[PDB]
A paper describes a structure:
However, it has been established for the H1 (1918), H2 (1957) and H3 (1968) pandemic viruses that a change in the binding specificity of the virus membrane glycoprotein, Haemagglutinin (HA), of avian viruses from a preference for α-2,3-linked sialo-saccharides (avian receptor) to a preference for α-2,6-linked sialo-saccharides (human receptor) is a prerequisite for efficient transmission of avian viruses to humans. However, surveillance of human H5 viruses has revealed a number of H5 mutants that show enhanced human receptor binding with HAs that contain other amino acid substitutions in the receptor binding sub-domain. We have carried out structural studies on the HAs of a number of H5 mutants that were isolated from infected humans in Vietnam and Egypt to explain differences in their receptor binding properties. None of the substituted residues in the mutants we have characterised make direct interactions with the receptors; they appear to have their effects by perturbing the biochemical properties of the receptor binding pocket.
Introduction of the double substitutions [name]/[name] and Asn186Lys/Gly143Arg, identified in viruses isolated from humans, indicated that the weakened avian receptor binding that resulted from [name] or Asn186Lys mutations alone can be partially restored by the second substitutions. In the case of the [name]/[name] combination, avian receptor binding decreases ~50-fold relative to the [name] wild-type as opposed to the ~1200-fold decrease resulting from the [name] single mutation. The [name]/[name] mutant virus has the same avidity towards human receptor as that of the [name] single mutant, suggesting that increased human receptor binding by the double mutant is mainly brought about by the [name] substitution. The [name]/[name] and Asn186Lys/Gly143Arg mutants of [name] have increased binding for human receptors but reduced binding for avian receptors. In both the [name]/[name] and Asn186Lys mutants, the stabilising hydrogen bond between Asn-186 and Gln-226 is lost, either due to loss of the asparagine side-chain as a result of the Asn186Lys substitution, or to an altered Asn-186 side-chain rotamer influenced by the nearby [name] substitution. The human receptor complexes of the two [name] mutant HAs also illustrate that the bound receptors are in close proximity to the substitutions [name] and Asn186Lys, whereas the [name] substitution is located 17 Å away from the nearest atom of the receptor. Thus, as with the Gly143Arg substitution, the [name] substitution is also likely to enhance receptor binding electrostatically, consistent with the observation that both substitutions increase the net-charge of HA by +1 and have similar enhancing effects in virus binding assays (compare Fig. 1c and g).
Author numbering:
A (entry chain A), B (entry chain A), C (entry chain A): 1 to 321
D (entry chain B), E (entry chain B), F (entry chain B): 1 to 162
Write the structure that this text describes.
Amino acid sequence: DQICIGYHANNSTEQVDTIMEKNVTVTHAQDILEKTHNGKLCDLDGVKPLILRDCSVAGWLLGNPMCDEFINVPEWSYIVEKANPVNDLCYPGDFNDYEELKHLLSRINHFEKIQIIPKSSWSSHEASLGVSSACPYQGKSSFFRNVVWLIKKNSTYPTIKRSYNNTNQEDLLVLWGIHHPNDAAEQTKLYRNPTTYISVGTSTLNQRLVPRIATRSKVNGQNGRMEFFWTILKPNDAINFESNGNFIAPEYAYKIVKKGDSTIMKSELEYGNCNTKCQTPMGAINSSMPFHNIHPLTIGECPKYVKSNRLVLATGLRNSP
Amino acid sequence: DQICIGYHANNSTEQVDTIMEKNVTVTHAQDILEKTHNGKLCDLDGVKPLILRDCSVAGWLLGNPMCDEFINVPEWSYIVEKANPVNDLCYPGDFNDYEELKHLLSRINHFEKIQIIPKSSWSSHEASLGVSSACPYQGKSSFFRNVVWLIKKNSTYPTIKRSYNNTNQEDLLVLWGIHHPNDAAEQTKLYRNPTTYISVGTSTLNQRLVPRIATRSKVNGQNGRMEFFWTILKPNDAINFESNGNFIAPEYAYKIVKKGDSTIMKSELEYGNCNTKCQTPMGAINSSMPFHNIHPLTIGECPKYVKSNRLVLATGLRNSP
Amino acid sequence: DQICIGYHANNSTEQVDTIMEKNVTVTHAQDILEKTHNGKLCDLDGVKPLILRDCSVAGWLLGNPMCDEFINVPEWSYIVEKANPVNDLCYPGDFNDYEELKHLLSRINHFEKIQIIPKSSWSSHEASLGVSSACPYQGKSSFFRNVVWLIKKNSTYPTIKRSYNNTNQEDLLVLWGIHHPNDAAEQTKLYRNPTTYISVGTSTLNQRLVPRIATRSKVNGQNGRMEFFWTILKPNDAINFESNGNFIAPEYAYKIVKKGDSTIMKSELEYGNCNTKCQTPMGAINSSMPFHNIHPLTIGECPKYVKSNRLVLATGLRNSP
Amino acid sequence: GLFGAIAGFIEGGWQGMVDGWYGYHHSNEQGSGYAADKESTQKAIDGVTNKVNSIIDKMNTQFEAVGREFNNLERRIENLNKKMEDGFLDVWTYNAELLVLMENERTLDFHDSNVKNLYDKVRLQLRDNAKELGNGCFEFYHKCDNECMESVRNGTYDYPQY
Amino acid sequence: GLFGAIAGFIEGGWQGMVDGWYGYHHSNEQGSGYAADKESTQKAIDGVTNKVNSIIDKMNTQFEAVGREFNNLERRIENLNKKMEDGFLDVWTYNAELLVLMENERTLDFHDSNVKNLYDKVRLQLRDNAKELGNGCFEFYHKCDNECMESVRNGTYDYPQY
Amino acid sequence: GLFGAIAGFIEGGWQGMVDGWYGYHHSNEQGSGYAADKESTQKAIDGVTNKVNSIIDKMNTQFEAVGREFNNLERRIENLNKKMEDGFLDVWTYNAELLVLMENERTLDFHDSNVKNLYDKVRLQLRDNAKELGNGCFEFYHKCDNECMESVRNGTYDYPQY
Ligand SMILES: *[C@@H]1O[C@H](CO)[C@@H](O[C@@H]2O[C@H](CO)[C@@H](O[C@H]3O[C@H](CO[C@H]4O[C@H](CO)[C@@H](O)[C@H](O)[C@@H]4O)[C@@H](O)[C@H](O[C@@H]4O[C@H](CO)[C@@H](O)[C@H](O)[C@@H]4O)[C@@H]3O)[C@H](O)[C@H]2NC(C)=O)[C@H](O)[C@H]1NC(C)=O
Ligand SMILES: *[C@@H]1O[C@H](CO)[C@@H](O[C@@H]2O[C@H](CO)[C@@H](O[C@H]3O[C@H](CO[C@H]4O[C@H](CO)[C@@H](O)[C@H](O)[C@@H]4O)[C@@H](O)[C@H](O[C@@H]4O[C@H](CO)[C@@H](O)[C@H](O)[C@@H]4O)[C@@H]3O)[C@H](O)[C@H]2NC(C)=O)[C@H](O)[C@H]1NC(C)=O
Ligand SMILES: *[C@@H]1O[C@H](CO)[C@@H](O[C@@H]2O[C@H](CO)[C@@H](O[C@H]3O[C@H](CO[C@H]4O[C@H](CO)[C@@H](O)[C@H](O)[C@@H]4O)[C@@H](O)[C@H](O[C@@H]4O[C@H](CO)[C@@H](O)[C@H](O)[C@@H]4O)[C@@H]3O)[C@H](O)[C@H]2NC(C)=O)[C@H](O)[C@H]1NC(C)=O
Ligand SMILES: *[C@H]1O[C@H](CO)[C@@H](O[C@@H]2O[C@H](CO)[C@@H](O[C@@H]3O[C@H](CO)[C@@H](O)[C@H](O)[C@@H]3O)[C@H](O)[C@H]2NC(C)=O)[C@H](O)[C@H]1NC(C)=O
Ligand SMILES: *[C@H]1O[C@H](CO)[C@@H](O[C@@H]2O[C@H](CO)[C@@H](O[C@@H]3O[C@H](CO)[C@@H](O)[C@H](O)[C@@H]3O)[C@H](O)[C@H]2NC(C)=O)[C@H](O)[C@H]1NC(C)=O
Ligand SMILES: *[C@H]1O[C@H](CO)[C@@H](O[C@@H]2O[C@H](CO)[C@@H](O[C@@H]3O[C@H](CO)[C@@H](O)[C@H](O)[C@@H]3O)[C@H](O)[C@H]2NC(C)=O)[C@H](O)[C@H]1NC(C)=O
Ligand SMILES: *[C@@H]1O[C@H](CO)[C@@H](O[C@@H]2O[C@H](CO)[C@@H](O)[C@H](O)[C@H]2NC(C)=O)[C@H](O)[C@H]1NC(C)=O
Ligand SMILES: *[C@@H]1O[C@H](CO)[C@@H](O[C@@H]2O[C@H](CO)[C@@H](O)[C@H](O)[C@H]2NC(C)=O)[C@H](O)[C@H]1NC(C)=O
Ligand SMILES: *[C@@H]1O[C@H](CO)[C@@H](O[C@@H]2O[C@H](CO)[C@@H](O)[C@H](O)[C@H]2NC(C)=O)[C@H](O)[C@H]1NC(C)=O
Ligand SMILES: *[C@@H]1O[C@H](CO)[C@@H](O)[C@H](O)[C@H]1NC(C)=O
Ligand SMILES: *[C@@H]1O[C@H](CO)[C@@H](O)[C@H](O)[C@H]1NC(C)=O
Ligand SMILES: *[C@@H]1O[C@H](CO)[C@@H](O)[C@H](O)[C@H]1NC(C)=O
Ligand SMILES: *[C@@H]1O[C@H](CO)[C@@H](O)[C@H](O)[C@H]1NC(C)=O
Ligand SMILES: *[C@@H]1O[C@H](CO)[C@@H](O)[C@H](O)[C@H]1NC(C)=O
Ligand SMILES: *[C@@H]1O[C@H](CO)[C@@H](O)[C@H](O)[C@H]1NC(C)=O
């Protein structure tokens, strides 16, 4: 008659690593690393992202005519831009402080577009021939929809003196631009005046742009260049435009209605018609694991990213053969 | 007759946490986290800080007339600026590379102010009507005390050509500015010349400021703007000023006499009449603990900041009921 | 008759530290920290570094005549510049975006120098009197070898309109400059035209430099200043130069033939005629240890830098007296 | 293991014991079988559960990256940004992997300890009244029926009676 | 605990023993009382002291933040700066909290070990001359007076004599 | 140590035992000498080797600095860069130093454990047939010649025979 002390064993093949030994078979274990995703771009808590598709953020904000899909976008959870979107600046040029603006959009969930300077209200200047074959729409020449390329009217460009006042409650994103023509002849043709300027003033802003006229390489068949600028107009503050040529004026601006959590995600994926509480640039995550190894840039209620291939905790004891 | 092995117990209720169990009562423990401060801004090793109160660093350096308290400040241990000081730039404008200058002050403990260009020495220009109602002092119009707003004398602004030489042993902080008037009429009224400039040269510096004349919003009732610039003048090097208008000239500059450890601290607190070896923006720390959880930005001989609410080491053993 | 259990002891004096006790003598130990280096700058896998000696990176690229040693350098493993090289910009001035360029060289292993605008091809301008006593070579006045200081020919500076096209397969580093003379008389003497410009255009670049003419301190006996600029010319893209004076034109540019791993190392050491798989700014490392404490900035197959003085693992057991 | 019981003086585990982590096997004239020790098993369960939740909790306040764009002439700060994000991910990866390795070692040792301690609890009861076989087992000098056996699992084994 | 002594086969501690962490209680015809074991107690004190100072020392070379201002169009680098400072504080917070958790576990086990080892030191002396009660105590077969008891605490208990 | 054997109830190590980490010494009429226990020694060797390689492996994916220049008006970002590089080096330095401290503690305890377990393996064989001396040694009641001794090292010591 005898009695023995002993411990559990089972058919488990689960292995855990330790400092002194690897691949120790244990009776029980708990995986704590999520390795799978759904491979899709999803709504985040039922709120669909803004998927720019082939448009870049600049083509969207300026109103590149190939980006009419985003003429009035609802509130978004996050934004998805491609690595090299084709529809950027149809007419070649630059976008001043572009990356500082993108950074601003990581904190923005909703824009409401509003008209600040009506197209019809340009009575001393021509405001309908500001169109280029570099920015085509349905076969015809067009231009960025949110700005107006003003040119001379009956061979005169009188000094422009306009001013908008932010009466509405929000902060306002105002955009404008300057045209850098190829040569002195092009300058005189479009604007008459040989030497020109655009001065822009707010409470904080005090700039004076002058066109640099130089020989350039063609890009989308254009020797000219457009430089685009922006500012945030605080509520109850006014912006003053003065110019005698080369001015790319704002027609529409964006009210900032919703601040908060958002991000600009780089991905070649498109919309997947799913919902999720955690999204990555390569797919969404549905798990209660503390960790995952899918991608570092996530948005939502996410596990913590680590670079491991395997994280498994022993719960049970060493399993015997 | 028997003998027993055993261990200590006592009336301790001190608890420590472990990985496998929380709130284990032990006979002895050692708290290692400091949670208390005195709530005051104190001298640091007997050396009082510079407490700018309602002045900003710019209002102090330029000599905003509401900042006379800081007309000649002794050596400091650290500087305390508020989040939104009211007395900044009485006359609206900008301060070029302001944040790079503040960063310079984190390594500076003492300035000696000295006169580089006497106010009296402006014999071809008017140097006493450079005053604004935006910068009032005892009810009258005044201006930044360390710079001179030169205007035309008997309807003439002859080209200014001045030069200071850093003969003294230190590095010198030189400050100047440019006036951006509202319109062409204001320009001609103050300086006659329609188009003007200010050129500033050292061994390294080679700039040429031109005034941008534009319509602006009023701020403290001013349509104009002042842009302030700075440079560090190395010893035995000379600074060359050339201008024909709009020039805000230096009268006083600051010798940098003491380098070393300092910081600009943001706090709404005022002086507390205490001493301490470790200071935070919400109070001073007097303890020999290795850690504290009061605030990340400290100055002095400080414990290490952690974000914990509790850090307690077991020293004794598990206490039995 | 008896049998005893026991353990090894030996004459080892090796000590290891633990949390509860320091300097515990053990029978065996393994040092894992490398503390020694050879004190030399070495080839990295047989590939010799570029040792600029007394030349700075700017003096090398622009062709400072005191830097003829580096007129045609082979492929390098890493670059070694001193802290304060004497042969920088013989003629005083600035180098625009210099640090962003150095950062570009950390990813570059080889340049091939090529002629883009022949010196002989300047038929309407004088291209052999652009020489200064500040840039001497064998006792005579000279100048940066990779650029041309164009001055007026028979009292005329006709507008320059030149253009190079990147036909070759690589990216091309193009360099140029602008002259900032001391006064209006010097300007007219060298270039005739009172007011001048240099416009430079590519697909992305669109600049217009104007000379700032001001009184300056002499540096190497020069009141003037040269500002140097650069750009990377993508393959199959063309660069357009337009100017009417003050232009420092490119003669030679650098083809970027090899990208990859490199670095700019700061060191006062010179070449040591050795080989190594791991190099620091104070010497090379030959060891299989996981860690070292020599210097943080290494290049190659290196151990991991830690700041410890000692890291020793116990392997054996506690050694008894 | 450190405590010498699991895969030590007790060669192997019991497929037959299904209702606990540690326990007893008895053999006598009436028959044989297994019985889990509920106390030490439940202690083990609580320990390991708390440990897991402790791990999950420590790691949930941890670095999370965000996208930042930079242009062609902001390469230094872009590189700074890349090296900063990668720097922290390496640190957290190292932390996670090490914590698991270390805590797995301790978990396996914990189980070894519980078994060793259970073996000792019984040894200290039996004393001179059973032969210690050297393999986890105790052969009784007296006949020990099912109620005797239960009393050994009870902790209430009357040594003097036998 | 891992070693089975504290709150194991020794149910509880002694309010009565005030002059040390571990020790002996004796009972005989002359009376009873407690005696701290100075050796093992002092070893414990040194261990725990060194540990504390070791912890304090490791942590004193550690990240310390400084203020940096940024303007309205330097948001990216401001954010970089915020995420960098917060990144390190999380890392150090994690390090501190974990070190304490881990070292508390080890400290409690250390004490358990010292008690277990003291119990064994005495068991190995007494051998067959005392009954091992199963609860930390040893009942002697011979009468054991105060000098006999001291000899057991000495380490110089003459087994053969008894 | 935690397990009480090394520099505990076994006062000191053996200069005489050269061919292993743990083992036996015997004394009888035919003579005396040492014999390494190859099993437990080899287990120790593998453990410590794996540990070392584990340490070396964890640390090889770790922060590595690169040079970045900044000009006179980029002091903030230069300082950001300095504090970022130093920040990570402190973290890794702390990690390395702590890992070594902690793993040294565990390594020394591991050895203590192996000795303790070897002592127990033999104790559990001898049972009542030898006096447990209290110092690592076992004095036999029967005469035990070299083949008897080998059988104790075998694990195949026939208790009933003696
Ligand atoms: C863009 O447009 C908006 C809307 O027109 C501009 O805001 C308005 O600007 C005017 C000045 O042009 C401000 O001043 C007038 O109104 C104030 C109102 O005072 C109180 O009452 C209103 C309710 O009607 C309330 O909302 C305010 O908060 C405030 O409590 C008058 O007091 C002021 O006249 C003053 O009277 C004081 C007492 O006698 C004197 O001390 C003063 O010296 C002065 O004479 C004047 O009539 C408006 O307050 C302001 N309205 C709003 C809704 O913001 C905005 O300025 C413009 N931007 C730019 C850049 O031009
Ligand atoms: C701001 O003002 C200061 C003070 O005026 C300027 O510094 C001075 O600048 C002058 C030139 O304008 C320098 O050169 C003169 O003095 C040197 C002195 O040489 C030695 O002796 C002095 C002691 O008196 C000592 O401090 C120096 O360290 C040095 O060892 C003369 O040598 C020099 O003349 C030269 O003689 C050499 C030998 O014959 C020749 O090789 C040279 O070619 C030359 O002819 C001349 O007379 C001063 O050295 C200097 N003084 C000080 C105290 O720094 C400073 O330049 C100015 N800044 C600007 C931007 O203008
Ligand atoms: C720097 O100099 C280089 C070299 O001169 C410039 O690159 C060349 O630029 C010309 C335009 O000036 C390009 O267009 C011509 O050639 C293409 C070639 O097309 C195919 O065939 C070549 C092989 O010969 C192959 O390499 C190409 O990949 C391509 O498959 C012609 O097609 C083109 O004419 C067109 O015909 C099409 C069909 O009829 C029409 O749709 C078009 O509307 C058009 O009429 C034209 O003759 C060259 O392709 C290009 N060569 C190379 C080797 O890159 C470069 O532009 C210049 N830079 C600057 C900034 O000026
Ligand atoms: C653990 O197990 C032991 C042994 O099995 C238990 O002892 C037994 O306990 C039972 C349950 O009450 C006793 O039953 C009683 O029997 C008497 C007469 O035989 C009867 O008059 C009562 O009505 C009752 O049925 C049994 O006598 C007793 N026997 C022995 C030999 O111990 C013990 O109770 C258990 N203790 C614990 C702490 O679990
Ligand atoms: C630990 O304790 C034991 C037992 O208490 C000690 O043994 C006793 O030690 C005392 C102290 O010296 C001895 O006293 C001597 O007595 C003899 C005759 O009785 C006398 O001639 C001497 O002048 C002296 O007073 C005592 O005899 C002795 N007795 C016994 C039974 O052991 C022991 O010394 C202690 N050892 C250690 C290492 O602490
Ligand atoms: C471990 O050691 C024990 C004791 O040394 C071993 O037992 C002995 O093993 C030897 C080797 O085979 C036996 O030799 C045989 O002897 C018989 C007659 O004496 C002979 O007919 C055979 O040809 C052979 O030589 C020896 O008898 C035996 N003796 C005793 C007392 O045990 C044992 O084999 C070893 N076991 C292990 C697992 O290492
Ligand atoms: C521990 O086990 C792992 C997983 O089974 C082993 O890694 C695999 O090895 C197999 C066979 O050599 C390969 O085909 C797989 O590619 C490996 N998979 C992974 C995820 O690594 C590993 O070799 C074992 N490690 C040790 C130290 O024994
Ligand atoms: C461990 O004890 C702590 C401190 O007593 C407990 O936390 C407190 O719980 C009480 C009662 O529920 C609350 O009123 C307090 O707000 C808590 N204080 C703090 C600082 O947390 C805690 O619940 C216990 N933890 C566990 C796991 O049992
Ligand atoms: C542990 O030993 C080290 C190394 O021997 C001791 O440090 C040395 O102490 C000697 C004598 O005091 C000094 O001369 C050396 O300068 C020290 N060297 C180093 C590298 O530190 C150390 O004091 C001992 N530590 C403890 C806690 O006992
Ligand atoms: C292992 O055992 C369980 C019994 O608990 C059984 O249900 C399961 O099918 C088995 N799995 C394998 C792979 O044999
Ligand atoms: C996530 O997947 C699990 C499968 O384990 C499922 O039970 C759960 O409903 C899913 N939740 C969502 C929101 O997709
Ligand atoms: C606990 O015990 C000590 C005796 O050492 C006594 O002085 C103290 O007052 C007691 N504290 C409490 C709260 O009972
Ligand atoms: C700090 O406070 C302690 C109270 O524990 C006091 O003894 C000490 O004198 C104080 N020191 C200073 C400098 O305030
Ligand atoms: C230590 O012992 C070894 C024998 O293994 C011997 O070779 C060596 O010389 C000794 N070293 C010292 C310093 O005594
Ligand atoms: C590095 O030094 C070791 C000395 O231990 C030597 O054996 C080896 O050949 C050396 N290798 C090189 C590449 O210098």
